[PDB]
Amino acid sequence: AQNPNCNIMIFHPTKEEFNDFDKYIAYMESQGAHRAGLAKIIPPKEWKARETYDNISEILIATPLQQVASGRAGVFTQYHKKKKAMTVGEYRHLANSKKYQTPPHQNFEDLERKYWKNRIYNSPIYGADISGSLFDENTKQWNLGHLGTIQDLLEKECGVVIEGVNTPYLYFGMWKTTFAWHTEDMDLYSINYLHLGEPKTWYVVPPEHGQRLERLARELFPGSSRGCGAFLRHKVALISPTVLKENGIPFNRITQEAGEFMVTFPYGYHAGFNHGFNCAEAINFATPRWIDYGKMASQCSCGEARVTFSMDAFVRILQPERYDLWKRGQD
Ligand SMILES: O=C(O)CNC(=O)C(=O)O
Ligand SMILES: [Mg+2]
Ligand code: NI
Ligand SMILES: [Zn+2]
DSSP: OOSTTOOOEEEOOOTTTTSOHHHHHHHHHHTTGGGGSEEEEOOOTTOOSOSOSTTOTTOEESSOEEEEEEEETTEEEEEEEEOOOEEHHHHHHHHTSTTTSOOOOSSHHHHHHHHHHHGGGOOOEEEEEEEOOOSOTTOOSSOTTSSOOHHHHHHHHHOOOOOOOOOOEEEEEOTTOEEEEEOOGGGOEEEEEEEEESOEEEEEEOGGGHHHHHHHHHHHSHHHHHHOTTGGGGOOEEEOHHHHHHTTOOOEEEEEOTTOEEEEOTTOEEEEEESSSEEEEEEEEOOGGGHHHHTTOOOOOSSSSOOOTTHHHHHHHHOHHHHHHHHHHHO
16 A cells, blocks of 8 residues: 555656646556645646746735634634735735734744744735636646646546536735635545745645544534534634644644645645745646545535535535535525
């Protein structure tokens, strides 16, 4: 069995190996990468996402979100307060202001300590889930707006044409901006490219141990759990590495830097934070191996999670028994 300890693997494809996305994902899996829940991919030195980042300031962040925390330093929830629109140039200046800028620090581990100690006492502002792309149209390898669609994958595997589309999203972050513990919608893969700026630290639980995290989360968030059997789908709960270690939950950590891809695998719970101003692009994708995970994915039917149009068909075809209840939660 490859990668039996479920370590995060780091890959360095050549330019030739970077030509066929599906093949390279399947290669990484043949080496056991999926067992971690997360892998890093360093592009060949010949590759670039676009020529420059000098022309992105006029992108609009229509609904910046202030991430306000409740709880204790290692175990908290966050809610997202809506703020007035601002451009990427305005947001970059904000991020670099004395109120929001990264503090002085020694190394990534010192900054991690500061994050966990202090996050709850501040409310950083995040631009999230902005439909769009920063890949140049002439980047032909690993261009996140030209991947195979999940609807085409389901049709190829199962035979049924379905409605829906699959496009990328941009994320503009600052120090302390946080992504809560979650798996992807319908336990899909994700791919994330850090276009520019400061790093992103990730935490991940191996897929084979996902239910351990779920059981701890029900214990640590007991009102939320009573509310919804799949409340981690609300994307609001944070648990620190110290708390996970105290409770014997298997996990790993890694820091992504600008110019690097991360891939999350089906049913890999993950969470993390940004080190300072940055811009990432991300999209969900599928392979043949995902279908069995999509059929088994939990679902939020309480009303909170509210998702993309295109989840409808995945539930309808893969989970027909759950469809009627799930759809009531959407309405
Ligand atoms: O960059 C982010 O905000 C986090 N993105 C993801 O969690 C992802 O790619 O799965
Ligand atoms: Mg612009
Ligand atoms: Ni994710
Ligand atoms: Zn719910």
